Amino acid sequence: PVWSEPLYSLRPEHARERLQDDSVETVTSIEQAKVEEKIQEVFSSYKFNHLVPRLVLQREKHFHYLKRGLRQLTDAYECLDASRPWLCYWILHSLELLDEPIPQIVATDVCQFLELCQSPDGGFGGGPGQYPHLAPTYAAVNALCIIGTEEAYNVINREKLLQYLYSLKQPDGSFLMHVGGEVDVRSAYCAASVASLTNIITPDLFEGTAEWIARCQNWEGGIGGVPGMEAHGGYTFCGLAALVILKKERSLNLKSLLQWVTSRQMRFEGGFQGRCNKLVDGCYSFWQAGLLPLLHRALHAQGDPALSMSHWMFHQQALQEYILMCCQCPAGGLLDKPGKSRDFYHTCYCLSGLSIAQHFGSGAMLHDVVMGVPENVLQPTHPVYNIGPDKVIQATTHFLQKPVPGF
Amino acid sequence: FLSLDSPTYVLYRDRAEWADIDPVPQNDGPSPVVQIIYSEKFRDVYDYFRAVLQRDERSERAFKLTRDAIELNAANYTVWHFRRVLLRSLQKDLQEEMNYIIAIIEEQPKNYQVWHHRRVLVEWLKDPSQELEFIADILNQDAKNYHAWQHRQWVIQEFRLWDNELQYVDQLLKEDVRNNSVWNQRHFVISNTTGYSDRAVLEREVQYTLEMIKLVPHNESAWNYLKGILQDRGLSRYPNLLNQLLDLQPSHSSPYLIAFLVDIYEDMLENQCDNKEDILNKALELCEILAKEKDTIRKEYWRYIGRSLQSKHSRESDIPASV
């Protein structure tokens, strides 16, 4: 009809999705309230300016922002000094999603650089001469993979890498994030992500790891960082993902998990929150929603007959709307929410989340949902590694040609 | 000695006592990527740190240097590590170090390194006396600090300091019953002390949870807890619940309430209850009210649930294709 609003968030009924504090004010509610009111302005901006809303993904703008960042950064990116590989990844991936080609000049430099970040003992540090750490190592790999050149691949010292992973393995199945570092579910995921891609997984490498991960699932249905801790998207993702690689998804109560994640999508905002009763955030568009594809794959493997054949178990339209309308910086780059500044981390994940929301794929079945202008469509991303599915396959294949270190 | 923010602060290259050392530049290679254009101070300190690290100079001055690098980028784990090394090597006073770290945490509480450092300290000292109160203070600034909570859990656990936590939990819930972290904590405490099997406890909890729901029916946290504490044993296992929930529908409804109901029916149908069909329909009706009106954001989930329930609990589900 004519009076019909195609945008879910703008529909008059949608207003009923505003918070009901039950006249009981606590810090949690107030904060949520502030956010909702701010988001409201965003939604209503079209109405009050008297313009018909057009959802446009500022590709050009984002590309420029990325393009430059890949080369150099201001004194503001100082505290990210121990996490440079992440920058490489966040950016490269973001470009890959945007379908921007990678010049071989760039590629080679990235390689050489990452080489400089490779520790003599295996694994990668957050900068040349820094000690190796699982997070930068995960990043380094994913990055090198997005490139996929033989050069890129040959950078990685698989033997050392494996040794490294072992030096971090814990008796209770967990892993340190680095020598003398801390332990939580991230380590498991990083160790797995890289181990699988590089084909270095030995029989005992992940002994008990799955069970450790399992113990992180809590009463909320989600997953905490370590047994006993509150459920959180990042950790939840890390956990599931790790388990999916370990092919041990079954070790979890996938039901409660599902119910948990789906409840994380903010009714009014459309985007996802990291943990129950906290604020929404762009990054979670991936961290949280990325779980759906994982779950779908897992449940389906259990012959789950009730599974949809065209959508993920979250409001794809609403996520996409949130992203587009509130997480884009005019000058380029993406963000947490309105009022927050852009940064590569959010740019990377908001996009990833977006791609996910537009791309449904379960075997032969494929169905997209592209809100706004069709130029908005992105390259698909793999739900486990969060890199181009093609890159995944390309990578694994190449590495399977190699023998698991030691034989 | 000379605070990094001190007006008289001087670059290490302009420091006499450091004249014997040649700074090590960052080896970024011929044609850099993600090159940070560090400020003078920054580049200077780390250039010097790089040196001491390389030389593995385990000196007092090195110790003081680390404080600086940290102040610059407290996320630099390599620095942290080396600092621990120096603490051991230099036989530094750990309490003095505690003072230090507590200050640091206070300023950048949302960092991994800082916490892990304090953890290690406490471990070395085998002294938790300061922990709780400290953590409280941090939590008093951000009642949802994930790192702090995690630390607290670790502490209480390693030092069996359970005695006063529930009391704490209670206080926080009073301040903000919507604090999910607290709800997790409460479950953490109970699980490891009395356990939930103890019926008097179970009961007490539920009373309290319902009482909370009554006061704030829209607080998704209480609901999640409630579900959290009864689900494993089986929702059907507690018949009065259903009736009791139905009673709140009038002046205390919410998509949460409706949802819970579906979970109950779900479990009831799982444990082959009376009026198989009657329940089933009540459930599907709800899946619809949720998917179409009361909780559309989760339409895809709701459609799936109803579809699953239909898939295994319709009168036709156990009936052969030929009938």
Binding site: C79, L80, S83, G126, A135, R186, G234 | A75, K110, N111
Partner: peptide
């Protein structure tokens, strides 16, 4: 700005 994941 900082990196909240490590």
């Amino acid at each position: 700005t900082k990196c909240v994941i490590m």
